[PDB]
Design a protein around this nucleic acid. Structure first.
Ligand SMILES: [Mg+2]
Ligand SMILES: [Mg+2]
Ligand SMILES: [Mg+2]
Ligand SMILES: [Mg+2]
Ligand SMILES: [Mg+2]
Ligand SMILES: [Mg+2]
Ligand SMILES: [Mg+2]
Ligand SMILES: [Mg+2]
Lengths: 107, 62, 49, 49, 131
RNA sequence: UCUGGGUCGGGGUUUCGUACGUAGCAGAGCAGCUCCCUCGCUGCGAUCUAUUGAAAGUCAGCCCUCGACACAAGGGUUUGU
RNA sequence: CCCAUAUCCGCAGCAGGUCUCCAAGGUGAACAGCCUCUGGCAUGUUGGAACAAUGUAGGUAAGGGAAGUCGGCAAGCCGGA
């Protein structure tokens, strides 16, 4: 239905290619947000603060190549907002990235 | 069309590749690429170089 | 097809190919085929799993 | 794309005569064309309508 | 017969190649190249094979303040040898000849590029190795 | 549409040069333990060797997937002899 | 209370100018340059998206090596001990 959660891996070292040194970490976070707005069909995604602490872990210009990300549509209950749904983009720590696909996640 | 061996890495040069180098004592060498010849011209031994053919027969890696 | 009448000796040369290179153009390729590269390099680590 | 070839040259009286040169070639991929129409032109004093 | 194909020249006018025969010269400072018509601001350059007017800068004093014809026999710049082989030498070198091609010296030390072993037969007969 | 093209994954290619751990009677030497030993056995120790052409990267404008996962007849503005 | 890249003078929240006191760890000859702690700040009066020409500031370059130019101008080389 409308509420669902999946885990994705995001290839950051293909969306940050060729952008200048002091914009690689800020551009990464507006590539996370753009990945989620296409993947779930929602605007108003919200990045968890330990997710950008992950992408800023090696400074502004050396960003991780891949990061494992858990998306989640949620019904926007805090106000009668024009966006009925919002997306929460929590971070998944993982050692290797080999053989990881997109996986539906249970509650 | 004669297929010739790289004087540093022991690989197999095909007729469109690499460059030959005539040192002024009579000796002619063949190099596969610029990685091989810069390693050659900086005088280092291909037996201390882990990816050459001479390394892999000194250590019997086949 | 050309608009001219080809009368030069270079234009009327019968050719006969002898070798066609098939090394990888995505870098400095060394190996003409796949079966050559495997027969030279030997069994790697990721094969013997 | 491009590759390169080896062939033997027959230029009588040349430096590369009966020798092996390396030529650079271009691969042009040509599937068969499908003929779907005919159009006819007439000669006019203003060209070819 | 056969004519010389063009090669990468890479040895302009102000160059100092070293003399490679027993005439007592140690350098050859090129001053022009025979055969160049030239373009505005382009410098005349020479490859292996080319006959060259040069003066010697150090060596025996009976060779020094004169202009001699010379032939470049080795070049450090890579040129393509038309079987897809790029070939280059450790140094730039030349021998002193006259207008007909006979050498003032008698024996060439070092190898000789085979492009000037074909144009210049009296050079090619005094060469120890034809690279 | 004989679906489709995306995102990951896999394979191919290629770049660099052999990862971390662990093991070694490999190591210039030094410090210790002596009921030991019958010349031992614990340490410290750059480096070496095996595991290991490994490890890491690879389209973002590289190649091939049919594996996984979603999504795609939806919108907006105008046009007539 | 300010004592100055915003409280002073310079028509201004002006890269200018304007007298002093205190002074940590590492490297090192060193209150040199570089990195950090105490303390301080939000990039110096706007953001976003692109990566064309031309610039301004910075780099590298085969083979020659001043042939350039009024002139080795600029850069490079040299460097400590
Ligand atoms: Mg290529
Ligand atoms: Mg201000
Ligand atoms: Mg700034
Ligand atoms: Mg700002
Ligand atoms: Mg240069
Ligand atoms: Mg001058
Ligand atoms: Mg002038
Ligand atoms: Mg100066």
């Amino acid at each position: 239905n409308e509420v669902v959660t999946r885990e994705y891996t995001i290839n950051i070292h293909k969306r940050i290619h060729g952008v200048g040194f002091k914009k690689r970490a800020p551009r990464a976070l507006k590539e996370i947000r753009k990945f989620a707005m296409k993947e779930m069909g929602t605007p108003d995604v919200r990045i968890d603060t330990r997710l950008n602490k992950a992408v800023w872990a090696k400074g502004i210009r050396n960003v991780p190549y891949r990061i494992r990300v858990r998306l989640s549509r949620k019904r926007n209950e805090d106000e009668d907002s024009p966006n009925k749904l919002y997306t929460l983009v929590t971070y998944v720590p993982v050692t290797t990235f080999k053989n990881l696909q997109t996986v539906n996640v249970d509650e | 069309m004669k297929v010739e061996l790289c004087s540093f890495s022991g690989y197999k040069i095909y007729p469109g590749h690499g460059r030959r180098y005539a040192r002024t004592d009579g000796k002619v060498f063949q190099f596969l690429n610029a990685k091989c010849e810069s390693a050659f011209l900086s005088k280092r031994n291909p037996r201390q170089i882990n990816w050459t053919v001479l390394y892999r027969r000194k250590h019997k890696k086949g | 097809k050309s608009l001219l009448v080809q009368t030069k000796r270079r234009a009327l040369e019968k050719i006969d190919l002898k070798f066609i290179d098939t090394t990888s153009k995505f870098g400095h390729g060394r190996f003409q085929t796949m079966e050559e590269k495997k027969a030279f390099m030997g069994p790697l680590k990721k094969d013997r799993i | 794309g491009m590759t390169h070839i080896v062939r033997e040259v027959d230029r009588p009286g040349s430096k590369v005569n009966k020798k092996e040169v390396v030529e650079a070639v271009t691969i042009v991929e040509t599937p068969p064309m499908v003929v779907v129409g005919i159009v006819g032109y007439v000669e006019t004093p203003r060209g070819l309508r | 017969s056969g004519a010389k194909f063009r090669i990468s020249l890479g040895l302009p006018v102000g160059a100092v190649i070293n003399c490679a025969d027993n005439t007592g010269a140690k350098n050859l400072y090129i001053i022009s190249v025979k055969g160049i018509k030239g373009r505005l601001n382009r410098l005349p350059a020479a490859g292996v094979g080319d006959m060259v007017m040069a003066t010697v800068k150090k060596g025996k004093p009976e060779l020094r303040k004169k202009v001699h014809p010379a032939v470049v026999i080795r070049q450090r710049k890579s040129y393509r040898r038309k079987d897809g082989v790029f070939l280059y030498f450790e140094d730039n070198a030349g021998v002193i000849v006259n207008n007909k091609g006979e050498m003032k010296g008698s024996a060439i030390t070092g190898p000789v590029a085979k492009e000037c072993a074909d144009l210049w037969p009296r050079i090619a007969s005094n060469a120890g190795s034809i690279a």
